Ligand binder design. Structure first.
Ligand SMILES: [Mn+2]
Ligand SMILES: [Mn+2]
Ligand SMILES: [Mn+2]
Ligand SMILES: [Mn+2]
Ligand SMILES: [Mn+2]
Ligand SMILES: [Mn+2]
Lengths: 460, 460
DNA sequence: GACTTGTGTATAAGAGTCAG
DNA sequence: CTGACTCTTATACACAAGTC
DNA sequence: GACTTGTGTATAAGAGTCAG
DNA sequence: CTGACTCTTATACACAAGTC
């Protein structure tokens, strides 16, 4: 959590114990990851800082047949495990994304849409660890990459196995820490076999309900049984404004709105397998006439008896969206789909390194995040703090304490172009990255002047 | 040509005499163009440097119903005319591009492809001025914007009129300088009416031949008449390697190759209108068995009698491609098609300003271009020169004179990620821009340190 | 000298993106 | 998904600065 | 101790992009 | 269009640095 800001130190902490069969391969991996992270989002060539040696080293590495992509990912994951020791409770957000390509190599990749689709690639199923107290991103725990064959019949295994395979790997890598982990998954994980496996291992989860299932004790579908349960209390949410574009391409507004939800919970036993677990039902009270009511039914191992316990389950699930944020940081952010390697294994090795660069992008912003009155020196070097103060002169908002962490956040965000168009105070990880990059880049000039003046040389 | 590097000075020189009906509108235009150029390629918000006032000013300007887009373009064009006074010969490259949009506003824009196409926008016909001695970009002379109607029958004028309309505007704005101007156009301008208009005005041109035409004196098609003309001599070209993707999407290599061409010329008289002009025919000698022979037939006002005169015509025409380079600098570079204004006039005003930002991108690189031994101080401030020397330390190639212009070019290009993958020594305008932006950004830190140390303040 | 338009501030929100 | 943002357009008010 | 793999240098070029 | 580039993969050689 501390090795983060300096790219070389971050890379070392993430990758230095990679088992690639040659310590030179491991050292090169550390260096490649370092230059990529320093120039997050940018090409291998740009990241080489004019060094032909570093450029050739980087390209040779990603096309190296003795370098296992799995072993790159595992090394990074074991670092996540290491950091996870610090926390009494963790959330393991789990979901699938695609990596889509259309250049020649696509021919050799797997199906994503139709058999006729030019866009081909991998499906990647990922587990992302958060600490469950303040929801900071701890890191990647697992990724399974596979290619979908054109003919379903040629598949070596069914794709619903992905949730169980992720659990098996999580279990194995976390060891005795697994009991601190709540897995969090959308409706696609609402699979009897998945629920059974988690409960069999005494493992913890919050999974959204998709299919109607009978409760043995009541003989009712979960929804109907939960509707009968006494109201625990309620909560209100603010759903913010956004544009929406649908599948065909039609555009409509979704205005901001308030919704009030009632909350209900209970212990349930699924007819199939006779397995027992908890459920929470959140349902909108008085939905507007022209809207579909909010409704979440969540299946969980967690306690749900009190209002506060049920609200915790609801809150845990609202953090599922972090993994989609990771997906964006991996693609738009780190450039997973901008890569143009010409062989599947080269692309895989490169894009596997970038999954870690992506996590850092999210953590970079979190390291600056706003009930305290911290100073900026806890996060920035004295030089960084001084230069930033120079750059932000006249821009500090009234509500920012002069040399505080909150000020530093806002000032770096301002360097990144943040203008707070919705007045929430929250800048995107992209804006924070841009600001951080701008500060670091300006710091090169700052320090160059400092160095020359230390040598006693006249400036300009 | 001198006001270029400092964005505020450049903007003033380009736009300060815009006739918009209120000097405040003109001042705002200067400021908007300045911030956009400083942050070339970047959004209005990023360009506002955290100033809410500048952001609101910029958005209000582009949606201002009292601001004519035509008057913005004219102002910039009159500056081109002004700079053109310095040169004894000019090339006026002329061509059309599209500006393509797919957001809501597209509905209100014109047809680009099929009636069913979601992509809609403007066609823009542009005249770009170069000086014909060293081929530096002088600036935009003319743009005609129009929307193609879904039904050809609703068109107020035929699109082939564009070449004549460009000539009429060029003529009008250049006045007596027109005689210094050679218009340069591809095969789409091979229109009798266009040739007649140029010759009627004693205007100069090099236009590639598309349609077979009879020569009166010989009774032959131009090609057959020119094939009979005595060989003037030849030349050899090196056609470089590139990938090619065709209309359907099929990929093939085009390997580098040498071609030898024979050169032939003559005076010709077109049967229709009885108009007299010159022609040059370049044709490949001994084409490889599996290739279509190189063949250019160019129609011109220029002398063609000697080998050197015909070679000059060929050379003039090889610079037509500059306008496509401008098109790229306007779209990919300056972000013409990244703009998301929600009304046609707003988009037009914004994208019209960006056409000038685009020209600057091309000129930025040209200002550093490599038979002399100049010093860097002719192009850079002493601070810029010192910082760059600090940044490039250890990267200077053997063939670069220590503090020269060539060194400065290469060093800024290296900051932009240039690694000379084809060993030509030529960096793209994009790489030079990136390097220049990086130098300027680092210069902020350099100068901040200089300022603090001048105030006697301890650094870090 | 009468009337309209721009600036800078605070506030609000529809449109668009990537993700899907 | 109750996403999480940035880009764009817009309003009132109190002056400043334009035009006719 | 015998054999294979990486590094850094010089050289070459196929693949891909935007433009079209 | 005889575009003008960047991204990617590749080769030889002379050592350095790995493995078995
Ligand atoms: Mn998902
Ligand atoms: Mn999903
Ligand atoms: Mn335990
Ligand atoms: Mn063209
Ligand atoms: Mn054309
Ligand atoms: Mn004259």
């Amino acid at each position: 959590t501390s090795a983060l800001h300096r790219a070389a130190d971050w890379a070392k902490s993430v990758f230095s114990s990679a088992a690639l069969g040659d310590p030179r391969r491991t050292a090169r991996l550390v260096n490649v990851a370092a230059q990529l992270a320093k120039y997050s989002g940018k090409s291998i060539t740009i990241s080489s800082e004019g060094s032909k040696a570093a450029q050739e080293g980087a390209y040779r590495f990603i096309r190296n047949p003795n370098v296992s992509a799995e072993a790159i990912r595992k090394a990074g994951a074991m670092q996540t495990v290491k950091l996870a020791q610090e926390f009494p409770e963790l959330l393991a957000i789990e979901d699938t994304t695609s990596l889509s390509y259309r250049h020649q190599v696509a021919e050799e990749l797997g199906k994503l849409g139709s058999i006729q689709d030019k866009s081909r690639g991998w499906w990647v199923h990922s587990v992302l660890l958060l600490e469950a107290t303040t929801f900071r991103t701890v890191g990647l725990l697992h990724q399974e990459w596979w290619m979908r064959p054109d003919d379903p019949a040629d598949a070596d295994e069914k794709e619903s196995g992905k949730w169980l395979a992720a659990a098996a790997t999580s279990r194995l890598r976390m060891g005795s820490m697994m009991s601190n982990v709540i897995a969090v998954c959308d409706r696609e994980a609402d699979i009897h076999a998945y629920l059974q496996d988690k409960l069999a291992h005494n493992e913890r989860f919050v999974v959204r309900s998709k299919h109607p299932r009978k409760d043995v004790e009541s003989g009712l579908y979960l929804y109907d049984h939960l509707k009968n349960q006494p109201e625990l209390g309620g909560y209100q949410i603010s759903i913010p404004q956004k544009g929406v574009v649908d599948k065909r391409g039609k555009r409509k507004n979704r205005p901001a709105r308030k919704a009030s939800l009632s909350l209900r919970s209970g212990r349930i036993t699924l007819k199939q397998g006779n397995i027992t677990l908890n459920a929470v039902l959140a349902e909108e009270i008085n939905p507007p006439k022209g809207e579909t009511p909010l409704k979440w039914l969540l299946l969980t191992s967690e306690p749900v008896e009190s209002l506060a316990q049920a609200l915790r389950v609801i809150d845990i699930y609202t953090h599922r969206w972090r993994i989609e944020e990771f997906h964006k940081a991996w693609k738009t952010g780190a450039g997973a789909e901008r890569q143009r390697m010409e062989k599947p294994d080269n692309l895989e090795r490169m894009v596997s390194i970038l999954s870690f660069v992506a996590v850092r992008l999210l953590q970079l912003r979190e390291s600056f995040t706003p009930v305290e009155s911290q100073s900026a020196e806890t996060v920035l070097t004295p030089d960084e703090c001084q230069l930033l103060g120079y750059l932000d002169k006249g821009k500090r908002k009234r509500k920012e304490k002069a040399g505080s962490l909150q000020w530093a956040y806002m000032a770096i965000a301002r360097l990144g172009g943040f203008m707070d168009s919705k007045r929430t105070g929250i800048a995107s990880w992209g804006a924070l990255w841009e600001g951080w990059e701008a500060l670091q880049s300006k710091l090169d000039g700052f320090l160059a002047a400092k160095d020359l003046m230390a040598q006693g040389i006249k400036i300009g």
